[PDB]
Amino acid sequence: HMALSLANYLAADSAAEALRRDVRAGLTATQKSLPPKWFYDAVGSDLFDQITRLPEYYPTRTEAQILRTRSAEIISAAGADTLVELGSGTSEKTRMLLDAMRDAELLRRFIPFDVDAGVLRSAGAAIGAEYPGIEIDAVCGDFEEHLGKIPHVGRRLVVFLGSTIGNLTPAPRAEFLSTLADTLQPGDSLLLGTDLVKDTGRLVRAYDDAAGVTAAFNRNVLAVVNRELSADFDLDAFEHVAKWNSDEERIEMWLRARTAQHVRVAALDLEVDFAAGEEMLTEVSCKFRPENVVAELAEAGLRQTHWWTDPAGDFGLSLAVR
Ligand SMILES: O=C(O)[C@H](Cc1c[nH+]c[nH]1)[NH+]1CCOCC1
């Protein structure tokens, strides 16, 4: 029910300042862009939840199937009594891992780490009910800033699933893995999900579904800016575009102005213009090669001890240690 510890390192005013800075920088750049972290307000989070069930969006169900068939092996290899989730704690994937830890009579502690305190409370109540006696220590924070705030207690399995790591470009990605590695003690393990290079048609369709749900998700960042910064983006004026970048081997989401648009952002005393056909970058989703996952882990000071992948080779999970 209500048993919980929660530390909260995210302030509303600090988030508001960050949005103002990001939007100013992003909209005044010659090549316009917006950071994807701002996708995930309440509406955008619900849209992403729906995305995970789209026929075209294979990543979630593919990762889940790997966990479904190999969770016992993962938990045995980790030997952890504490599950740290860099993420909500709300998915069936979490429960697959917790179940396996319970089955092995190892489970003692759950540490959900996410940006929404309300979500963490909900996760804590649900998990607390399903695994009686489990200790829950929630951390409300940003995984690019507050990894050092994660408690160093027990033998910890830190999981970073869904190929979230792919939403970081190489420089911030390397910094993230290095920082994360620095927090691991002997006996701790990282479980990392990475979406893999594959048929490019399938990749593009995964980010441009027939039902237009990803398009709604993408355009919602404009609604976020409209509401929070008193802007007047016309969402109907922007086309959703998903591209495969073969040089960087990443999916990119863009918003393309159908016609010329004049946008006023009142909170920033700012006016910007979009030319007809002008495109604005809103997200990258890097796709990996198995050999390069090993390399990127190595550069961060982590040794991959286990590698799991579906029979189609669509998705991969790494276990890595110091
Ligand atoms: O790149 C993706 O596949 C998604 C974001 C996304 C899905 N569809 C469009 N963007 N990310 C992966 C795991 O959760 C965090 C976000």
Same domain as 187, residue 82? yes
Tokens linked to 209: 């579904």
As a whole number of angstroms, the distance between CA 255 and CA 148 comes to: 35
**Nearest alpha carbon to residue 135 among 143, 119, 124, 126:** 124
Q: What are phi and psi of 57, to 5 degrees?
A: -90, 85
Residue in 73, 53, 60 with CA at minimum distance from that of residue 314: 60
Residues 165, 131 within the same domain: yes
Q: Are residues 301 and 208 in the same domain?
A: no
Distances (CA, A) of 161 to 165, 195, 249, 319: 8, 10, 20, 11
Are 150 and 38 in a shared domain? no
Shared domain check, 204 and 64 = no
Residue in 86, 161, 164 to alter for ligand 1 test, most ligand atoms within 8 A of Cβ: 164
* Residue 312 in tokens: 């189609």
**184 three-class SS:** coil
212 and 319 fall within a common domain: no
* Domain co-membership, 304 together with 207: no
297 in the same domain as 149: yes
Method: X-ray
Question: For ligand 1, is residue 162 a contact (CB within 6 Å)?
Answer: yes
Q: Is 282 in the pocket of ligand 1 (CB under 6 A)?
A: no
| Reported resolution, Å | 1.9
User: How far is the C-alpha of 79 from the C-alpha of 81, rounded, in Å?
Assistant: 7
Same-domain pairing of 74 and 172: yes
For residues 122 and 90, is the Cβ–Cβ distance under 8 A?
Answer: yes
Q: Could you give the number of structural domains in the chain?
A: 2
Q: Which residue has the tokens 């789209």?
A: 54
- Pick from 40, 45, 48 the residue to mutate for probing ligand 1's pocket: most ligand atoms within 8 Å of its CB: 48
Spatial separation of the C-alpha atoms in residues 242 and 285, rounded to whole Å:
10
Q: Which domain holds residue 26?
A: 13-57+199-287
Q: Is 120 helix (H, G, I), strand (E, B) or coil?
A: helix
Other CB atoms within 10 A of residue 315 CB: 25
At which residue do the structure tokens 């591209």 appear?
243
Cβ of 154 below 6 Å from ligand 1: no
Nearest residue CA, atom 12 of ligand 1? Answer: 164
Distance CA 51, CA 210 (A): 11
Single-letter amino acid code for the residue at 249? E
User: 159 by DSSP, 3-state: which?
Assistant: strand
Ligand 1 site, residue 218, Cβ cutoff 6 A: no
d(CA 93, CA 98): 9
Residue type for 173, please? R
Q: How many residues are recorded in the chain? A: 322
**Encoded tokens for 43:** 């509406």
Hey, which residues does 320 pair with through a beta bridge?
190, 304
169 and 226 housed in the same domain: no
Distance between CA atoms of 313 and 62, rounded to whole angstroms?
A: 10
**Ligand 1 neighbour 207 (Cβ under 6 A):** yes
In this structure, what CATH number is given to the domain that contains residue 62? 3.40.50.150
155 SS3 class: coil
Amino acid at 169: T
CA distances from 133 to 118, 127, 146 (A): 22, 10, 27
